[PDB]
């Protein structure tokens, strides 16, 4: 039962053995029942972590490759190693994507959950776009944008920016516009419009939501300065 | 070629994911070459980290198990036993490599590989069960003994290997044998012997020797306390 797998997931977290935490909540996905926000958060942490480890690896190898571009055979081998990372990273992403697409997004009833998963689909397609090239990149970027926009157009109706999942969307969506669409003016305009829509109510937030909101808004604000700089 | 394997190991180190590092340095070693001190250090970094993540996990999971008051505790146990079987598999994977290739092959090299054997038996000893817990610790103390003899005869007390013996061997004594007196004797001997060369140390190994001695000093404080 998934009730056991929830504890198995928490166990796999505390060990820093996220692969098992993901493998648990993945089978919690295949239950077809609607995840509670606790499970949703666990699954997010799980695959965000498992991908993050490969993202960090990939960026490191990618940098090492670009540092040594004159080095011939060992540059070739560094590329072979790098691709031997990328294929892992991609497999993890296609996993989580198909899991969202065939269970969670089909099921998600809450506007909040709809937003969260449509965001998350966007994110993981971005993490693929960061990897991909060519028409693969084109298609993945397109479907990431589609997923974000679908979430964005929903959350704009369904959530104030006083709720952190909307800010999390606005942050990640803006990072997508800057980092992947190469659209820094679009990125800054999106980020700023989200932030100042948050400023308009920034003092109305509840005890946790203000912490959560402030924790995100400081990233919105700092990205805004990073990009305006 | 060994060189491209060593390079892929280095690359995996730089990427900071070590299982492919260890799994390459293994097949570097199966050539039966004497690992030079660089690939020797890479092999240690690799297997040490690959075990160290499991060690951390095990400590965490054992703590959670102790913090249990059920499927809950059973599950905590079953995950622990998975971790332990991983850690055992990896240690066996190292120890057989040393016995088959490395320990079969200089005093420094002898001492390094023998210490390493000792430590991997010690990390089994953290996890071991049944009467063979004795045979594990025995084979560790056997390796450390051959190491301590070779180093006390053929390593100046400046040598960081010779101190790494005493330090780990004392951790074995205190954590595995609960014999703080046995630990502190060897530790103080090594510490003061290094101080007999405190200014004779090499320009880098000053920091090495003093860091090893700081850890000696702190755990000497523990085991005397």
């Amino acid at each position: 039962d998934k009730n056991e797998l929830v504890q198995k997931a928490k166990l796999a977290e505390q060990a820093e053995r996220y692969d098992d935490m993901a493998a648990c909540m993945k089978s919690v996905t295949e239950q077809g029942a609607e995840l509670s926000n606790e499970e949703r958060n666990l699954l997010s942490v799980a695959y965000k972590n498992v991908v993050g480890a490969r993202r960090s690896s990939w960026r490191v190898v990618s940098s090492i490759e670009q540092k040594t571009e004159g080095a011939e055979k060992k540059q070739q081998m560094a590329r072979e190693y790098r691709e031997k990372i990328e294929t892992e990273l991609r497999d993890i992403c296609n996993d989580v994507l198909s899991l969202l697409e065939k269970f969670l997004i089909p099921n998600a009833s809450q506007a909040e959950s709809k937003v969260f998963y449509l965001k998350m689909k966007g994110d993981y397609y971005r993490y693929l776009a960061e990897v991909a090239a060519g028409d693969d990149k084109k298609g993945i970027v397109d479907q990431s944008q589609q997923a974000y926009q679908e979430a964005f157009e929903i959350s704009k109706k369904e959530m104030q920016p006083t709720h952190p999942i909307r800010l999390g969307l606005a942050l990640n969506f803006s990072v997508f516009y800057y980092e992947i669409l190469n659209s820094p003016e679009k990125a800054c305009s999106l980020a700023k419009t989200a932030f100042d829509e948050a400023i308009a109510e920034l003092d109305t937030l509840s005890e946790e939501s203000y912490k959560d909101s402030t924790l995100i808004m400081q990233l919105l604000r700092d990205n805004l300065t990073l990009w305006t700089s | 070629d060994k060189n491209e394997l060593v390079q892929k190991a280095k690359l995996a180190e730089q990427a900071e994911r070590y299982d492919d590092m260890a799994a390459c340095m293994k097949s570097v070693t199966e050539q039966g070459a004497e690992l030079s001190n660089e690939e020797r250090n890479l092999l240690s970094v690799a297997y040490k980290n690959v075990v160290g993540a499991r060690r951390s996990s095990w400590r965490v999971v054992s703590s959670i198990e102790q913090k249990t008051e059920e499927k809950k505790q059973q599950m905590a146990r079953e995950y622990r036993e998975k971790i332990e079987t991983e850690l055992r598999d990896i240690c066996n994977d190292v120890l057989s490599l040393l016995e088959k290739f490395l320990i079969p092959n200089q005093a420094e090299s002898k001492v390094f590989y023998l210490k390493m054997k000792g430590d991997y038996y010690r990390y089994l000893a953290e996890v071991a069960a049944g009467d063979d817990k004795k045979g594990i610790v025995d084979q560790s103390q056997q390796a450390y003994q051959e190491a301590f003899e070779i180093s006390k005869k053929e390593m100046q007390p400046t040598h960081p290997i010779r101190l790494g013996l005493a330090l780990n061997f004392s951790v074995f004594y205190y954590e595995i044998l609960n014999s703080p007196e046995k630990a502190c004797s060897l530790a103080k001997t090594a510490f003061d012997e290094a101080i007999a060369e405190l200014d004779t140390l090499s320009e880098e190994s000053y920091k090495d020797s003093t860091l090893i001695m700081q850890l000696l000093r702190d755990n000497l404080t523990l085991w005397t306390s």
Partner: peptide, 11 residues
């Protein structure tokens, strides 16, 4: 007890 040793952003 112890022993021997060996700019963008998102959500």
């Amino acid at each position: 007890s112890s022993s021997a040793p060996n700019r963008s952003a998102s959500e």
